Amino acid sequence: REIITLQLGQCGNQIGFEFWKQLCAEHGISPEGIVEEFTDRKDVFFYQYIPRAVLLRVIHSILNSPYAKLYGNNWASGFSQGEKIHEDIFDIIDREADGSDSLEGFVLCHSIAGGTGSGLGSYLLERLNDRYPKKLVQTYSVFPVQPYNSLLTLKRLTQNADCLVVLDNTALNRIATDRLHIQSFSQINQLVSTIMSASTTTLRYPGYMNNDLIGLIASLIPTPRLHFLMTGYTPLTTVLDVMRRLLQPKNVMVSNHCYIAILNIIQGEVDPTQVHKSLQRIRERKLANFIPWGPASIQVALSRKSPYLRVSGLMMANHTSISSLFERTCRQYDKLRKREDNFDEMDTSREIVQQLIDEYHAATRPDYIS
Amino acid sequence: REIITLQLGQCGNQIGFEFWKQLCAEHGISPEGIVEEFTDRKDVFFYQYIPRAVLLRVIHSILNSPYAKLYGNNWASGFSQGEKIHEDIFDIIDREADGSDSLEGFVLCHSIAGGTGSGLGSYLLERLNDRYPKKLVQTYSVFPVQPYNSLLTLKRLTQNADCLVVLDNTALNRIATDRLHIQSFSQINQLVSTIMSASTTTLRYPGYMNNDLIGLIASLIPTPRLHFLMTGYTPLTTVLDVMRRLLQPKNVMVSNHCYIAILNIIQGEVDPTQVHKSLQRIRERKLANFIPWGPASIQVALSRKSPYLRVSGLMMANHTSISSLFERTCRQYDKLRKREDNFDEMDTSREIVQQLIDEYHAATRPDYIS
Amino acid sequence: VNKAAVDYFFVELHLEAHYEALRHFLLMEDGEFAQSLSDLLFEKLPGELLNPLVLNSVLSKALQCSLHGDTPHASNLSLALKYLPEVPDVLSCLELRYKVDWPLNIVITEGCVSKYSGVFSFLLQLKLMMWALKDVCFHLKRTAMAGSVQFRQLQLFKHEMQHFVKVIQGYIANQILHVTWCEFRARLALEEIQRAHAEYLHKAVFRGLLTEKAAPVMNVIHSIFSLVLKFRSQLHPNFALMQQSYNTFKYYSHFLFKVVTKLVNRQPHLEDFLLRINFNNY
Ligand SMILES: Nc1nc2c(ncn2[C@@H]2O[C@H](COP(=O)(O)OP(=O)(O)O)[C@@H](O)[C@H]2O)c(=O)[nH]1
Ligand SMILES: Nc1nc2c(ncn2[C@@H]2O[C@H](COP(=O)(O)OP(=O)(O)O)[C@@H](O)[C@H]2O)c(=O)[nH]1
């Protein structure tokens, strides 16, 4: 069960290469895509070694790197181009699907703010649901005329992408100043790659459960509407030490309210006996609020750090506070609507996202059902 | 059974030259026509090494090439010159004919784009049916006053040549700019010579089925009229990767509709256990459409690459869409018929091809019989 | 002793060769040999073609046109017979037996080679079609001016009958020569050699529709092969006599597709046959 990855837009093509140079480094893979001498299951991302990538000016910058053998700005303008290269790119996609044994999902890296992303990323999600109906489409989208590109795209991600992880540049640029002291794009991307890498740790190493993308998402998303997640990377030592740093909003890249379900990923060699002791004290302290309506639990998983390269940690959070970020955007959208062929598609898009923010604000009530 | 080739005009002598280079590279044959040290039956094309070539301006540069040791613009004028040297040139054919053990066919490499050879091609086929009535003739014609010389030679090719492999420069240059990025003549022919080389993979290397030129043609061409073929060559990785990339209109060397018979030649060492599986997936997804009247299938055979020189593959098909190409040509004729000793041969030529265009359009109906 | 016995074979005088050599000759894998042996014998057709002066010599003329062989392995091809024919059918009984020496005779059983003769007489019988059918395709070529409904409607029968033979052969060229050879080649790399060989050939006669279990599937093949031979006899004085023949061919072929389908419920080997005989039809 392999996952074909697609990368669109400048931001998407840039983070992917930094995600690729990170992944092949964790394994014994030379930049020439050849194994070096120097158990780790490597089939999920590599084909027999070539990564199952489809990259879509910046391409020249990639081929000039020593990793060469590894393989306008308006929403309307980006879409029009898509329909014109409709047939051209799908043969690239289709041939990769038939080549794989049992294709499972579609990882996509794109930015709503990015024009090409706001035009070409949006078009694929409708076509991907049309051609292949039984394939999950999960995207590592990243939030930043600017509000327009954002809200118009959110209209597609709420009905096409059955999963999504948001990465806000505002909080990322903030974290860069306080604990990294940078002031560029070339520095903040270093931490972005760390998130995507540890996000797919349990899949690349043989474990007991979590052997597919479905094995991670299904516990998080209960309903087709509540399909937005958040990440948190603490190390920038026991099992109880790492969790107390996760729940602090000082490290989560975000700018009543309660979670839905938590997934914890530990990449260290900690003694797995005291993890049940850590959870007990957490329930005693009551550090995070939950939903009363439905049964939920806090989960944790273990794995092994790359030996060829100490405890790290990544958390997957499903919080209703993420709705506020939408409101801020849609608020600015209404601000530009009253100041400036049909101008109607942008009207229905504002209405459908109203349901999403409504669903989350109604989710934090004891009567979210019906 | 020996095979002999004839090259006419400027085009035929050019692609035939590179055809002799690539073929001489397949075997351990030095450019000086001497075997080096370094299974493959090299007797069908070479005669003790001496190739059975017949070359009819550029010839000077051909001898100036390191391979020297390896041996107007109207149609009626091209037909007149063929009559002025009727007996002079033919002696070469006869002395090469019976001097050979058993002649099997006649490979003809020529162009119909208004060249002196284009007429020169029309004459030879008339005499080849006159003298030798038991000798097959195959021709790898290539498509572009140009409407005139094109439609005329079609009158002879539809009743003399028992087979034909069409190659249109238009669909070739599309491949040139896209996957080679040329923006020349010696650049596109690099791929053209590749098509012909792999076209005789089952002849130079012995196999079980199709060990002779009548073994390939007799299956596809159903009637002496519907005798037009197209080619495909994907490598530019399992069996399901090859056949799926062949059926795409992005790879076909041509500018309702359905197939009559397909032939796929695999040259790799692929595992032959999965060749039936790929046949199942192509059927179930219904990626290709066949005739409704008779049971039409797709055939595949295996062979081995040159050990001196990776999974390659060739696709040979008889598609009724080839009728559209003629319609593009003859339409230009009627426009040139109204815009400009008897001018009666041009009449019967236009007449007979319009019978062929009727014969194709009638094959796509479920009641083609009677 | 054993280490000195095996070493004596390589450095002075190849079990892996004998297998990949008998296949070149018996199972007709090497072209230009069966296409030259069967092509010679079929040129004749009683008292002739039966004495050791022609059939014991046609082989020594065949190997020269092989372009592969003429080795110590290439000898020992006793082209003998096992019956004296008296006098349109699709049968010509004739064997072709390999021969071995002492240290190899103990492995290749004198019964296993006998089963090659079982699968051989079928494969040769197949060539009788692709030559006789090639004849009428070549016999009609010289007839060509003569263009009428009686002519074109006649030639469509050949293309309709040839395709059925060129697909059943493509099946044989996939099961008995390539996939059953993938096993027993990556399977090998002393008692096991006896059983592994007894399993290689046994799969070749099982996927070959020669087993008595699927025998009714084979009985129908003769009705097809027979009608093509009659089609060769009538090389338009008797067109209608041939039109009735083709209609009998389209019925029997339409009956095969049903008898194979009914035999799916009761053999994954036969599964690939229906995908071969049927493709965009019923
Ligand atoms: N996180 C991240 N975001 C980026 C990067 N490059 C561009 N972006 C985002 O992309 C947006 C600008 O889009 P732009 O690149 O002009 O779109 P394009 O002109 O279609 O490529 C900005 O708001 C950035 O937040 C990057 O390397 N990392
Ligand atoms: N496909 C292809 N066509 C060619 C090539 N070289 C020439 N031609 C065709 O040949 C035609 C010119 O013919 P020409 O050489 O003047 O005829 P000649 O002078 O009688 O030999 C042009 O219309 C081209 O399309 C080649 O390398 N490849």
**β B313-319/B230-233 pair status:** antiparallel
Nearest residue (CA) to ligand 1, atom 11 = A114
Structure tokens at C207: 């996927």
Which of C26, C33, C174 best tests the B interface by mutation, with the highest count of B CBs <10 A?
C174
Show which residues on chain C lie within 8 Å of chain B, measured between beta carbons.
28-32, 35, 67-68, 134, 137, 141-142, 144, 149, 152-153, 155-156, 159-160, 162-164, 166-167, 169-170, 173-174, 177-179, 182, 253, 272, 275-281
Residue type, B190: Q
- For residue B299, the tally of other CB atoms under 10 A from its CB is 22
Distance CA(A296)–CA(C228), nearest Å, equals 74
Q: Which chains does chain A touch, 3 or more C-beta pairs < 8 A?
A: B
Which DSSP symbol is given to A69?
Answer: G
Nearest residue (CA) to ligand 1, atom 28 = A11
Q: What Å distances lie between residue A298 and A252, A302, A318, B315, C189, CA to CA? A: 17, 14, 11, 56, 52
Distance CA(A46)–CA(B189), nearest Å, equals 35
Contact yes or no for B370 and C149 at CB 8 A? yes
Q: Are A256 and A362 within 8 A, CB to CB?
A: no
Contact yes or no for B250 and A99 at CB 8 A? no
Residue type, B140: Y
- For residue A148, the tally of other CB atoms under 10 A from its CB is 18
B33 marked as binding residue: no
Which of A139, A196, A164 has the alpha carbon at shortest distance from A17?
A: A196
Angle at CA B171, nearest 5°, toward B170 and B176? Answer: 95
B to A contact (≥3 Cβ pairs closer than 8 Å):
yes
- For residue A99, the tally of other CB atoms under 10 A from its CB is 18
Q: Within 13 Å, how many C-alpha atoms sit on residue A134's CB side?
A: 3
Distance CA(B163)–CA(B199), nearest Å, equals 13
User: Residue C49: which region, alpha, beta or left (left: phi > 0; alpha: psi -120 to 50)?
Assistant: left
B268 marked as binding residue: no
Q: Are B234 and B313 within 8 A, CB to CB?
A: yes
Instruction: Tell me the sheet residues that pair with B108.
Output: B6, B139
Distance B112 CA to ligand 2 centre (A): 8
Structure tokens at C222: 């003769």
Phi, psi of A160 (to 5 degrees): -100, -55
Distance CA(C101)–CA(C114), nearest Å, equals 16
CB crowding A41-63: b at 16 or more within 10 Å, else e: ebebbbeebebbbebbeeeeebe
Q: Are A138 and A161 within 8 A, CB to CB?
A: yes
CB crowding B153-176: b at 16 or more within 10 Å, else e: bbbbbbbbbbbbbbbbbebbeebb
Task: Kindly state if the Cβ of B306 falls inside 6 Å of ligand 2.
Answer: no
B231 marked as binding residue: no
Task: Kindly state if the Cβ of A16 falls inside 6 Å of ligand 1.
Answer: no
What is the distance in angstroms between the CA of the first residue and the CA of the last residue of chain C?
63
Which of C25, C45, C47 has the alpha carbon at shortest distance from C37?
A: C25
Size of interface B-C (CB pairs under 8 A): 97
Phi, psi of B302 (to 5 degrees): -110, 160
Distance A150 CA to ligand 1 centre (A): 12
* Residue C148, min C-alpha distance to chain B (Å): 11
Give the atom of ligand 2 at the shortest distance from the alpha carbon of B169. 1
Distance B84 CA to ligand 2 centre (A): 23
Nearest residue (CA) to ligand 1, atom 8 = A11
Which of C179, C178, C184, C186 has the alpha carbon at shortest distance from C196?
A: C184
- For residue C43, the tally of other CB atoms under 10 A from its CB is 9
SS (H, E, C) chain C: CHHHHHHHHHHHCCHHHHHHHHHHHCCCCCCCCHHHHHHHHHHHCCCCCCCCCCHHHHHHHHHHHCCCCCCCCCCCCECCCCCCCCCCCCCCCCCCECCCCHHHHCCCCCCHHHHHHHHHHHHHHHHHHHHHHHHHHHHCHHHCCCCCHHHHHHHHHHHHHHHHHHHHHHHHHHHHHHHHHHCCCCCCCCHHHHHHHHHHHHHHHHCCCCCCCCHHHHHHHHHHHHHHHHHHHCCCCCHHHHHHHHHHHHHHHHHHHHHHHHCCCCCHHHHHHHHHHCCCCC
Q: Are A204 and A45 within 8 A, CB to CB?
A: yes
Distance A257 CA to ligand 2 centre (A): 76
Residues of B in contact with C164 (CB under 8 A): 295
Residue type, A57: R
DSSP per-residue string spanning A11-55: HHHHHHHHHHHHHHHHTTB-TTS-B-------TTTEE--EE-EEE
CB crowding C119-153: b at 16 or more within 10 Å, else e: bbbbbbbbbbbbbbbbebeeeeeeeeeeeeeeeee
* Residue B342, min C-alpha distance to chain C (Å): 24
CB crowding A284-300: b at 16 or more within 10 Å, else e: eeeeeeebeeeebebbb
Residue type, A22: Q
- For residue A186, the tally of other CB atoms under 10 A from its CB is 9
Angle at CA B26, nearest 5°, toward B24 and B28? Answer: 75
Distance A288 CA to ligand 2 centre (A): 78
- For residue B20, the tally of other CB atoms under 10 A from its CB is 20
Residues of C in contact with B289 (CB under 8 A): 280
Residues of B in contact with C166 (CB under 8 A): 219, 299
Return the H-helix or E-strand segment holding A336.
helix A322-337
What is the rounded radius of gyration, in angstroms, for the C-alpha atoms of chain A?
21
Helix (H/G/I), strand (E/B), else coil: A106? strand
Question: How far is CA B56 from its chain centroid?
Answer: 19
Contacts 24+ apart (CB under 8 A), C4-9: C5/C103, C9/C103
Q: Which of A111, A112, A118 best tests ligand 1's pocket when mutated (most atoms within 8 Å of CB)?
A: A111
Structure tokens at A236: 């920038």
Task: Kindly state if the Cβ of B59 falls inside 6 Å of ligand 2.
Answer: no
Distance CA(A147)–CA(A333), nearest Å, equals 6
Cβ partners under 8 Å of residue A144, min gap 6: A111, A112, A113, A150, A169, A170
Q: Is the dihedral of CA C218, C219, C221, C225 positive or negative?
A: positive
Instruction: Tell me the sheet residues that pair with C115.
Output: none
Q: Are A252 and A288 within 8 A, CB to CB?
A: no
Contacts 24+ apart (CB under 8 A), B24-28: B24/B51, B24/B67, B24/B70, B25/B306, B25/B308, B25/B309, B26/B197, B26/B204, B26/B306, B26/B308, B26/B309, B27/B306, B27/B308, B28/B308
Helix (H/G/I), strand (E/B), else coil: B100? coil
Indicate the annotated binding residues of A for GTP: 113-119
Helix (H/G/I), strand (E/B), else coil: A363? coil
* Residue A313, min C-alpha distance to chain B (Å): 38
Residue type, B302: L
Beta strands in chain B (DSSP E): 2-7, 46-47, 50-51, 103-109, 138-139, 142-143, 167-168, 230-233, 259-266, 298-302, 313-319
Task: Kindly state if the Cβ of A113 falls inside 6 Å of ligand 1.
Answer: yes
Q: Are A126 and A92 within 8 A, CB to CB?
A: no
**β A230-233/A259-266 pair status:** unpaired
Task: Kindly state if the Cβ of A169 falls inside 6 Å of ligand 1.
Answer: yes
Q: Which of B11, B13, B77, B150 best tests ligand 2's pocket when mutated (most atoms within 8 Å of CB)?
A: B11
**β A136-139/A163-164 pair status:** parallel
Phi, psi of A229 (to 5 degrees): -125, 175
Distance CA(B187)–CA(B181), nearest Å, equals 10
Which of B240, B196, B223 has the alpha carbon at shortest distance from B108?
A: B196
Cβ partners under 8 Å of residue B119, min gap 6: B74, B75, B76, B77, B78, B79, B80, B81, B82, B149, B153
Structure tokens at B280: 């199942």
Q: Is the dihedral of CA C55, C61, C65, C71 positive or negative?
A: positive
Give the atom of ligand 2 at the shortest distance from the alpha carbon of B186. 27
Distance CA(B189)–CA(B268), nearest Å, equals 23
Which DSSP symbol is given to A117?
Answer: I
Phi, psi of A35 (to 5 degrees): -70, 140
Give the sheet arrangement for strand B230-233, strand by strand: B230-233, B313-319, B259-266, B298-302
Distance CA(C210)–CA(C222), nearest Å, equals 13
Distance CA(B352)–CA(B141), nearest Å, equals 19
Residues of C in contact with B292 (CB under 8 A): 280-281
Distance CA(A81)–CA(A79), nearest Å, equals 5
C to B contact (≥3 Cβ pairs closer than 8 Å):
yes
Q: What Å distances lie between residue B63 and B29, B46, B67, CA to CA? A: 18, 19, 7
Distance A106 CA to ligand 1 centre (A): 21
Torsion, Cα of C252, C256, C262, C265 (10° steps): 170
Which of C94, C241, C229, C119 has the alpha carbon at shortest distance from C165?
A: C229
B363 marked as binding residue: no
Contact yes or no for B299 and C144 at CB 8 A? no
Cβ partners under 8 Å of residue C29, min gap 6: B208, C23, C177
Give the atom of ligand 1 at the shortest distance from the alpha carbon of A192. 1
- For residue C197, the tally of other CB atoms under 10 A from its CB is 18
Task: Kindly state if the Cβ of A189 falls inside 6 Å of ligand 1.
Answer: yes
Which of B334, B364, B339, B328 has the alpha carbon at shortest distance from B349?
A: B334
Contact yes or no for B272 and C162 at CB 8 A? no
Helix (H/G/I), strand (E/B), else coil: A300? strand
Q: Is the dihedral of CA A108, A109, A115, A118 positive or negative?
A: positive
- For residue A7, the tally of other CB atoms under 10 A from its CB is 22
Phi, psi of A27 (to 5 degrees): -90, 175
Residues of A in contact with B240 (CB under 8 A): 98-99
User: Given in angstroms, what resolution was this structure solved at?
Assistant: 22.4
Distance CA(C29)–CA(C31), nearest Å, equals 6
Q: Which residues 200-219 of B are in CB contact (within 8 Å) with C?
A: 206-209, 211-212, 214, 218-219
